[PDB]
Each structure stands twice: as structure tokens, then as C-alpha cells.
Design a protein around this ligand. Structure first.
Ligand SMILES: CCCCCCCC/C=C\CCCCCCCC(=O)O[C@H](COC(=O)CCCCCCCCCCCCCCC)COP(=O)([O-])OCC[N+](C)(C)C
Ligand SMILES: CCCCCCCC/C=C\CCCCCCCC(=O)O[C@H](COC(=O)CCCCCCCCCCCCCCC)COP(=O)([O-])OCC[N+](C)(C)C
Ligand SMILES: CCCCCCCC/C=C\CCCCCCCC(=O)O[C@H](COC(=O)CCCCCCCCCCCCCCC)COP(=O)(O)OCCN
Ligand SMILES: CCCCCCCC/C=C\CCCCCCCC(=O)O[C@H](COC(=O)CCCCCCCCCCCCCCC)COP(=O)(O)OCCN
Ligand SMILES: CCCCCCCC/C=C\CCCCCCCC(=O)O[C@H](COC(=O)CCCCCCCCCCCCCCC)COP(=O)(O)OCCN
Ligand SMILES: C=C(C)[C@]12C[C@@H](C)[C@@]34O[C@](Cc5ccccc5)(O[C@@H]1[C@@H]3C=C(COC(=O)Cc1ccc(O)c(OC)c1)C[C@]1(O)C(=O)C(C)=C[C@@H]41)O2
Lengths: 532, 121, 94
């Protein structure tokens, strides 16, 4: 369990003993066998350090490049690089999981990663090690993208090896240096329409736990790729969707405004042009409601977000789904001869208009207002509700109790006190209650405590949030644009087929196996003239 | 911010007018009353006995909390940011404005340019 | 169009080859002629780097002062400083 498979070779490794590892692997110890334990497993419930399961993986993670280079080439018992553990981390994946974005750690892990890839290329030209998906089903590229490791991902995105024998693994090819512009040719390997965990998907679909999601899309290839996707086809599809939604909301508003007032539903169709227009508008409205219901169900089934992180990452989808629910309840009440249907429909009307702020996320300068509204409704107001309600209820019950012998009921007292809290009430002291002085004291304390002291506290916190997320306009709207691009591409399969997302699918080299490979790529010209 | 506010105003105005068709009589007056709410200048009464009174109260309270407490203060925070940003750079701003007015004054009256003696010698 | 007027003298320039420019301008290449292309023009719709049109302008913009000093004084074919391109940038303007 704890000490399952661990031997003196690991202890020599972690202590940096050059000769002990050589002696042990000369003795014939089977480095294929893996050591696992509670301390090794990535469990928060127990203390431990994760270094994979393969002993070669531990040697690599523990900063020993010559030692692992010998282990691999040790004729007595070479270690297999392609070993995949039950936990689901390969040696390369183990290195990815070790990294913590630090500059020195970035340099260390990148150097050892490049060295180990070169060694593997020397070892097994026939096999490509990178693409083998690990136990969880995501390759080291996808794992680095999803986990948050910007340092490990940046190099892999612009992984260029100047050795002419390693050109079949380099990701970035420098086409020429005609000037400060340096033409590029990335591999776009499994970035778009590839597999379960594409790089863009894991970057964007992530549950926001990752700590540097915004900075990931600043890498050299991702920015150009997303901008190309936006300009090519996505932009006009989004604008068409916005226009169709505006028409839908206008039709819904016109249909609901001119609803019949005499009788109970359903309402018999009368022979008039206006009646035909009204009924067709109602049919279109209900059709849109059904569409949004099904799109919400499809989204929730696809992503299946966790209950805790449901609202944080799916605010707009939640709101569209709730609007669809309201309209469906309205139609259900319509055919049950209940006049209450209207009361539901208006909630789907008022809501339907405000949901249009979703589309402001498709513009740069106007896109932050939706973000601010979402954050100020989920973070500040939500948890200030609890702080306010103890005050409201305490003083409401106290006032009602004091004068039992507009403040007659508990509902009206709560409403009047809430009006006081927003500076919208009248202090009169006109009626001759019992204990008038105590009533005046209670109301003045409430007004000073909630109107002057708590309301302004809430406003200060809201201003802090607005201030904080108003600096980061570029990052915020870039991420929102990326998410909408992903959703637009994924919604219409024919759209993905006709996207021409990649620049081209050309074979720009010959593999050491002897067969030239056709790889996807796109141009990325970057200007750097100061460095000459 | 006009665009962000008008969706709220129109959505809740149309909703309120639709809800009680059977001061909130017309669409113009409903829009005006809701705008007055947005600037803390309206009266919550709930005195007339409408249909669906609870839903009407819920709609108005949501509107007041969303626009008077949440959007208006957002606008005020952004305005304060702008004021703060262009209140540090007093010297540069007024220097540029003085330069522009000098140019326009010199260019307006040709005799003024002739008699300017702009150059030292 | 793209490769209109560009010759090996420019390629020696941008790579910082001291001797290649001397050889080319000893060969009698007419440095009066200007090279223009889509990459050279200051167009946002296309990628490119602007360095004027005159080859001397490119030599100057590409950080080569002794080389241009010789081009100007090269008795075989001195470059004219006062050359004005159709785009509208002089060497100084470049
Ligand atoms: C008709 C073509 C409908 C497809 C377009 C589409 O899905 O747009 C959609 C509206 O479209 C509708 O739902 C209205 C449907 C009726 C419109 C008829 C009026 C025309 C006169 C546009 O919206 P969307 O991008 O589907 O979703 C945005 C919000 N979620 C659902 C992604 C969270
Ligand atoms: C895209 C274009 C969308 C723009 C659409 C509509 C905007 C234009 C409305 C002008 C109508 C005036 C006539 C009038 O009031 O008489 C009505 C006939 O009019 C109707 O019933 C037509 C309403 C159906 C609209 C659905 C469009 C979907 C088509 C795709 C009958 O009487 P009434 O006046 O309803 O009764 C009093 C009602 N109030 C005044 C108390 C409210
Ligand atoms: C007025 C506010 C109206 C609705 C807000 C409800 C959503 C609040 C929580 C969303 C994010 C979240 O899960 O926070 C995490 C969970 O925190 C909570 O459990 C808060 C629950 C409050 C519910 C009301 C942190
Ligand atoms: C600062 C607050 C100043 C307000 C003090 C007086 C309030 C109005 C008032 O005096 O009410 C009149 C008299 O009531 C009183 O005497 C009550 C005095 C209590 C005042 C102390 C409140 C302090 C609480 C702050 C926290 C109404 O009855 P009448 O006019 O005597 O007939
Ligand atoms: C915090 C807000 C506290 C206000 C709650 C009660 C509002 C006034 C009220 O109760 O109206 C009276 C009763 O109306 C109701 O029962 C409606 C209750 C809905 C209150 C929930 C509002 C929450 C919305 C916030 C977003 C008027 O009719 P009556 O006096 O029964 O004859
Ligand atoms: C998150 C949820 C469920 C929510 C659903 C409704 C009831 C909502 O009240 C809240 C709670 C609330 C109530 C009153 C004041 C503030 C907040 O906030 C929103 C929700 C809060 C909004 C605010 O409008 C928006 O957020 C638009 C919007 C912003 C950003 C988006 O990404 C977006 O995509 C859809 C939409 C308006 C209402 O949806 C609306 O139109 C009505 C009548 C009630 C508002 O519950």
C-alpha cells in the first residue's frame, strides 16, 4: 500500500546520488515495475507529492537528466518511455502535472521535456509518443491546457527544434526571415475539431477553477486562429442570430401586447386580419420558446456542469432556460382555461428583453456591462442579502410587536421598512401610537443603520467590483468571444465542415520513418525588428 | 450605457402594461413612471387593486432593485472613474485646449496673423 | 507586383552582409531603380514591413550606415538622396 513497489533506486534518485542509481540498474532491477502509494497519489485528503508511478518518471521529475538518459539506454534493462500508469499520467504527462508555471520551473521542465523528446525520437522513430492519450483520455497537450500550466503549453505551441533530424516533431517552422516579419507554420495539431478534449475546448469549457485562463489565449497561435475564425464565418453567423432574436422579441412583444381581454383561454379565432396576425405571432413565440427549451437541455446534457459551479459559468444559459420554462408554463396554463397564464407570460417577456445583454458580449467596448451585472448579482448582492435580511426582519418584527395594541400587518411593515432602506419612505410620526418615543427611536435607528450605513457599504463593494473588472476589458471580451466562437462552431455541424478553420493541410516535411506526413498548419507572421 | 438601460426600461414597461391591461394605463406613462423609479424619484404605493397584484409588486421590486440600486450605481462608478482619470491630467489637457484656441484665433482674422509678430525675429 | 524590382542587393542588405552589397554595387546595379511590392506597402489589409521604395532607403532603415555611406559615394553608381517614391516617402521620410 504505502510502500508498494518502492525500492532503494527511488531513494538514491531523490537524494541525487549519481552512482547508486547506476549500481541498482546494473543489478538488473526491473524499472518497468511502478511504485504507488498514498503519499504518491494526488489526494488532497492526505499529504503527498505526485511524481507519477514509473521509476523513470520519478527520476525525470526529480531533476536528473543524465540519469534518466542512462536508464533509457541501460542495455541491462532499459526503461520504457511509453509506460502509462493506472492513475493516468505518462512520464510526459507526469512532467506536465509537476509544472507550476514558475519561470525557473518553466525553463527546467521545458529543457528536460525537449531532451526526453529528442531521446525518444532517437529511440523509436516508428512510434509517436505525444499522441497516446492517457487513462483519463487527454494527451499532455490537452492536460496542460486544461490544468492551467501556461509555461508548459507555450513552448509546446511554439516548439521549434533546429536539429534537421528532429524536424518531424517541431511544431513551429520558420518559413523565412524576409524581414522583421518571421513567417510561421504551426501544426495546429488537435486544436480544432479533433477529439474529446480539444485545446480550445478545455481552455474555454473549463469550470473557471484554472487560474490563468485569460492568459492562455495570448499564446502566439491561439490569438491568430481565433481571430481568423471570428472574421471568416463566425462573425456574420453571430450577427444573423442577433438579428433573428431581435425579430423574435419584437414579434413576442407585439403578440403579447394585443392579447384578448374578454373571456377565458383558449380564445376562438375571429375572422379578421388582425386576428390572423395575432395567432401567427403567438405560434412563432411558442416555437421560439420550445427552441430555447431544447437548446438549454442540449447544453446541460453536453457540458453537465457541477451543481456548485452551475451558476458561475452558465449564467446566460441558465437565464435563457428559465425564460423558456416561463413561456412553457404560460402555454400549459393557456390550454387549461386559467387566466393566470398571462402572469407567467409577462415574466418571460420582461426577461426575454433583458437577456439581450448576452449579445453585447459580441462587441468589444460594450461587452463589460453584462459581465458587471452578472458579477454584481452573483457575488455582492447575493451574499449581502443575508446581512440585510436579519436587519429587515428584526426591526419589522419589533415594530409590529410594539404597536399591536400602514404598520398594521407584517407584510406592510416589511415593505415600508424596505422603502426606508432605499431612501424612498416618509417619516411622519403623525398617528398617535402607544410608546411613540420608542417607535421613533426604532425607526431612526433603522434609517441610520440601513440607509446611511449598510446601503452605502453595498454601493462601495459594488464599485470595487466594477473597478476591478473594468480594467480587464481586453481579457474579458477576448474570453467571451472565444466561448461564443466555440459554441457557434459546435452548434451547426455543416458550419464546422465548411469552416476551413485551418490554414491548410500540407506535408511540409519527410518523417524519419521514410513517409512524408500531411500536417495541418497556418501562417503566423510576427514583427520583431528591434532584435534585428 | 443608454443601450444597456433601454432594454431594461422597455422590457419592464411592456411587461407591466401587458400585465394590467384588463398612472400605468398607457405605455408612455408606464415608461415615465419606471424612469422616475430608476432615479429614486418615484412612489411605491400598491394602492389600486389591479389583477395579479402580487406579480405586479414582484415586477416593480425587481425593477427598482435592478435599476436604482444596481445599474444606476454602476453608471455612477464608471463616471467617477472617468472623472478621476481626466482630473489628474489637468496641465496637459488645458495646455492642448489653449493651443487649439490659439490656432483658431490666429487663423480666424488674417490681419491678426499679419500683426501677430509670432516669430521673435 | 510582389517581387517587382527587388534584387539580391536588398537580400544582402537585410541580412547584414558587408561584402555582398559592395560586390553588387561594383557590378553596376542601378540603385536609382526602386523595388515595390504588397509586403513593402503600408497596407493593414496585408502583412508587410514598410522601408520605402529606394534601395538606399532600405539600406538606411535596416541599420547599415557605412554601407549607405558607400552607396552614396560609390563612383560606379551613386544613389540619389533626393529620390521621392510614388507612395510619397523620401529616405528621410522613410
Ligand atoms: C428561423 C431560423 C431560426 C434559427 C436561428 C436561431 O437559432 O436564432 C437564435 C434565436 O432564434 C430563436 O430562437 C427564434 C425562432 C423564431 C424566429 C422567427 C422570426 C423570423 C421573421 C439566436 O440565438 P442562439 O445563438 O440560438 O442562442 C443564444 C443564447 N443561448 C441559447 C446560446 C444560450
Ligand atoms: C415583424 C413586425 C412586427 C410588428 C407588429 C405590430 C405592430 C403594429 C400594431 C398596430 C395595430 C393597430 C390595430 C389595432 O389596435 O387593432 C387590433 C387588431 O390588431 C391586432 O390584433 C394585430 C396584432 C398582431 C401583431 C403580430 C405580428 C406578427 C406578424 C409576423 C384589434 O383591437 P386592439 O386595439 O388590439 O384592442 C385594444 C388593445 N389595447 C390598445 C388596449 C392594447
Ligand atoms: C439576489 C440574489 C439571487 C440569486 C443568486 C443565487 C446564486 C448564488 C450562488 C452562485 C455561485 C456559487 O455557487 O457560490 C459558491 C457557493 O456558495 C453558496 O453556497 C451560496 C448560496 C446562496 C443561495 C441564495 C461559493
Ligand atoms: C437626530 C434626530 C432628531 C429627532 C428628535 C425628535 C423627533 C421628533 C419628535 O420629537 O416627535 C414628537 C415627540 O417625540 C419625542 O419626544 C421622542 C424623542 C426621541 C428622540 C431621540 C432619537 C434618537 C435616535 C437616534 C439613533 C412627537 O410628539 P409631540 O410633537 O411631542 O406631540
Ligand atoms: C424586501 C421586500 C419586502 C416586501 C414584501 C411585501 C410587499 C407589500 C405587500 O405585501 O402587499 C400586500 C400583499 O401583497 C402580497 O402578498 C405580495 C407578496 C410579494 C412579496 C415578494 C417580493 C420579492 C421580490 C424581490 C426581488 C398588498 O395587498 P394586502 O395588503 O394583502 O391587502
Ligand atoms: C440568476 C437568476 C435566476 C435570476 C433570474 C431572474 C428572476 C432575474 O432575478 C435573479 C435574482 C435577482 C432578483 C432581483 C434583483 C436582482 C437579482 O437574477 C437573475 C435575473 C436578473 C436579471 C438581470 O438581467 C441580466 O442579467 C441580463 C444578462 C446579463 C448577462 C448575461 O450573460 C446574460 O445572458 C443571458 C443576461 C433580470 C431578470 O432575469 C428579469 O428579467 C426578471 C423579471 C428577474 C431577473 O434571479
Amino acid at each position: 500500500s504505502y510502500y508498494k513497489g518502492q525500492t532503494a533506486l527511488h531513494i538514491a534518485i531523490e537524494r541525487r546520488n549519481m552512482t547508486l542509481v547506476t549500481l541498482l540498474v546494473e543489478n538488473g532491477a526491473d524499472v518497468q515495475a511502478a511504485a504507488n502509494g498514498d503519499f504518491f497519489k494526488k489526494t488532497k485528503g492526505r499529504p503527498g507529492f505526485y511524481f507519477g508511478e514509473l521509476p523513470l518518471s520519478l527520476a525525470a521529475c526529480t531533476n536528473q537528466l543524465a540519469i534518466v538518459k542512462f536508464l533509457l539506454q541501460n542495455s541491462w534493462q532499459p526503461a520504457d518511455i511509453s509506460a502509462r500508469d493506472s492513475v493516468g499520467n505518462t512520464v510526459l504527462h507526469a512532467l506536465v502535472e509537476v509544472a507550476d508555471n514558475t519561470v525557473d520551473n518553466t525553463k527546467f521542465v521545458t529543457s528536460m521535456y525537449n531532451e526526453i523528446l529528442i531521446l525518444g525520437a532517437k529511440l523509436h522513430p516508428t512510434l509517436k509518443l505525444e499522441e497516446i492519450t492517457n487513462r483519463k483520455g487527454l494527451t499532455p497537450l490537452a492536460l496542460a491546457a486544461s490544468s492551467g500550466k501556461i509555461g508548459v503549453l507555450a513552448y509546446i505551441l511554439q516548439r521549434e527544434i533546429h536539429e534537421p533530424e528532429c524536424r518531424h516533431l517541431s511544431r513551429k517552422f520558420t518559413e523565412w526571415a524576409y524581414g522583421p516579419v518571421h513567417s510561421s507554420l504551426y501544426d495546429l495539431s488537435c486544436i480544432d475539431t479533433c477529439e474529446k478534449n480539444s485545446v480550445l475546448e478545455v481552455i474555454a469549457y473549463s469550470s473557471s477553477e484554472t487560474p490563468n485562463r485569460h492568459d492562455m489565449l495570448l499564446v502566439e497561435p491561439l490569438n491568430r486562429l481565433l481571430q481568423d475564425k471570428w472574421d471568416r464565418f463566425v462573425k456574420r453567423i453571430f450577427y444573423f442570430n442577433f438579428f433573428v432574436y431581435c425579430l423574435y422579441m419584437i414579434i413576442f412583444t407585439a403578440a403579447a401586447y394585443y392579447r384578448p381581454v374578454e373571456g377565458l383561454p383558449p380564445y376562438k379565432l375571429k375572422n379578421t386580419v388582425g386576428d390572423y396576425f395575432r395567432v401567427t405571432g403567438e405560434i412563432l413565440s411558442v416555437s421560439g420558446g420550445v427552441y430555447f427549451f431544447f437548446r438549454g437541455i442540449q447544453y446541460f446534457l453536453q457540458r453537465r456542469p457541477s451543481l456548485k459551479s452551475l451558476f458561475v459559468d452558465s449564467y446566460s444559459e441558465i437565464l435563457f432556460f428559465v425564460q423558456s420554462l416561463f413561456m412553457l408554463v404560460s402555454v400549459v396554463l393557456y390550454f387549461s382555461q386559467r387566466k393566470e397564464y398571462v402572469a407567467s407570460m409577462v415574466f418571460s417577456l420582461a426577461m426575454g428583453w433583458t437577456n439581450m445583454l448576452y449579445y453585447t458580449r459580441g462587441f468589444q467596448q460594450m461587452g463589460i456591462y453584462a459581465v458587471m451585472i452578472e458579477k454584481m448579482i452573483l457575488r455582492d448582492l447575493c451574499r449581502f442579502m443575508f446581512v440585510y435580511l436579519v436587519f429587515l426582519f428584526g426591526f419589522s418584527t419589533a415594530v409590529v410587536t410594539l404597536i399591536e395594541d400602514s404598520y398594521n400587518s407584517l407584510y406592510s411593515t416589511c415593505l415600508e421598512l424596505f422603502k426606508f432602506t432605499i431612501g424612498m419612505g416618509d417619516l411622519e410620526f403623525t398617528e398617535n401610537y402607544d410608546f411613540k418615543a420608542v417607535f421613533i427611536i426604532l425607526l431612526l435607528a433603522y434609517v441610520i443603520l440601513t440607509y446611511i450605513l449598510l446601503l452605502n457599504m453595498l454601493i462601495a463593494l459594488m464599485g470595487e467590483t466594477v473597478n476591478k473588472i473594468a480594467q480587464e476589458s481586453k481579457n474579458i471580451w477576448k474570453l467571451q468571444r472565444a466561448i461564443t466562437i466555440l459554441d457557434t462552431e459546435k452548434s451547426f455541424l455543416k458550419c464546422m465542415r465548411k469552416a476551413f478553420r485551418s490554414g491548410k493541410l500540407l506535408q511540409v516535411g519527410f518523417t524519419p520513418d521514410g513517409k512524408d506526413d500531411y500536417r495541418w498548419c497556418f501562417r503566423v507572421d510576427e514583427v520583431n525588428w528591434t532584435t534585428w
